């Protein structure tokens, strides 16, 4: 059934699984018309499909052309997400297909179940975890590939860079979710913490800076402090 704090080690076992987050699929700016009415303008979006064990990220870019002349776009966005996850599964060799797909939003369950009827042995599950994957568009290199896209495109990344050389999946997922939670809570402060020291750069083939093990411990500390600082700011606590 549902994935929670109890069954958290399950994310890092040897059963292939993917998280699917549809938050950034349908993105708009709301603006005034000449007549003083309100209208939306869509911008490019993305499906965030992640293997939490390997860090493999299937970033399906959703170009604004897929909305042209469609109605009820927030509903269509869930079905388009399900269509593209189904297409990704069918594109993978059998031995690479997931055994489980976990959706971050319960509204994705029916659309994905219906698109995956051909795969009765792939479990489609919700989660009780509040995951910060909405903040993926705060990672400069992911934001850049989404906004530059002129057509539908899939881009493959490792969201853990080379971390699994030095740490476990459990710890890499912990680091990723802390970084994304900090970027979601205070994007300016989070980026200041990550890029404050010019001597530490991002490799051309990486998303995050090249921190030594001791520097990651300091960065992780500074991210936890930011989340606590912001919690005090929000609730006057």
């Amino acid at each position: 059934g549902a994935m929670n704090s109890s069954n958290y080690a399950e994310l890092f076992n040897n059963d292939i699984k993917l998280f699917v987050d549809d938050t950034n699929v349908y993105r708009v700016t709301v603006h005034k018309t000449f007549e003083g009415n309100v209208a939306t303008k869509a911008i490019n979006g993305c499906i965030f499909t992640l293997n939490p064990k390997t860090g493999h990220l299937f970033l399906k870019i959703i170009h604004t052309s897929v909305w042209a002349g469609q109605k009820r776009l927030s509903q269509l966005a869930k079905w388009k997400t399900a269509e593209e996850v189904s297409a990704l599964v069918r594109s993978l060799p059998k031995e690479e297909q997931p055994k489980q797909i976990i959706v971050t939003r319960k509204a994705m369950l029916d659309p994905l179940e219906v698109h995956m009827l051909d795969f009765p042995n792939i479990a489609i599950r919700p989660t009780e975890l509040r995951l910060p994957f909405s903040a993926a568009m705060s990672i400069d290199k992911l934001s850049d590939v989404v906004m530059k896209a002129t057509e539908p495109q899939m881009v493959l990344f490792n969201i853990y860079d080379d971390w699994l050389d030095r740490i476990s999946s459990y710890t890499a997922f912990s680091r990723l979710t802390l970084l994304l939670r900090a970027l979601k809570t205070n994007e300016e402060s989070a980026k200041m913490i990550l890029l404050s020291d010019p001597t530490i750069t991002i490799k051309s083939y990486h998303l995050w800076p090249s921190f030594t093990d001791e520097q990651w411990i300091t960065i992780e500390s500074q991210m936890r402090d930011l989340i606590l600082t912001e919690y005090g700011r929000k609730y006057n606590v």
Partner: protein
Amino acid sequence: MNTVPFTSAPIEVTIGIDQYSFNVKENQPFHGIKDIPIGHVHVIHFQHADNSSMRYGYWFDCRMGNFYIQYDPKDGLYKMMEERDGAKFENIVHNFKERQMMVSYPKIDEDDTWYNLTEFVQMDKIRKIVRKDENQFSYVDSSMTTVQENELSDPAHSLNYTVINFKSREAIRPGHEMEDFLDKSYYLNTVMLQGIFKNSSNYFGELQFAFLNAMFFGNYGSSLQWHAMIELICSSATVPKHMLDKLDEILYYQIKTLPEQYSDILLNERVWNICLYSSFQKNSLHNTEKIMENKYPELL
């Protein structure tokens, strides 16, 4: 007007005949039911006074043979049987009527309730849902499961209702996933009506039979099937005008007949609220919406 004689009534029992019911005492001189209207299916049903466990009964059509009831003290139930000797049967009935040992099917001349509940129900269609080919009549009880319930155990004793599943390859054309899930018209019109039922009359017959088994036996799988067949129509944007008008009449008489005190167990809140207020057909069921709002406004 036809007769179902009883050999005897050795155990105290509530007897139903269609929408009517009568209490019979242990060894009361009761020899059956006369003046049963020709032209309709009927149901004769039982609930034992000493064990309200198992409601059970028999669907039959007096045009298809001479039927009687006899208690079996081994199996502990009232059994339907066919008498193949016409002259023996005629002599039995004549004697019991002459001695006034039978209750009369109590039809009011103005009253079209039973026709309105059974309009599309055919004995030959019942015998395909309830498979026991050596009898012309069909046994149903409280506990019998549906083929769909047995997928999600003894298949010979099952109710073979048409399986309806909104998240099945049958319901959803590859490439029309959103379309077919949000608008069930494909599944209703091509798969069920043209494909399996052949016509709306057969679809309504199954819907009506499922309702009657839910009401008369408290059969849970029958109640699930009744709601699934209503939801499939109400969830379809494209339904023939004659089918919507007929469904409104069918549901009106079903809601009219339901005992007020069984509404909590026989009616599914989600399905009715969805059908009356959210669905494509929310404005198409005027008579059903009015009786539901006036009789069961709590459910809504």
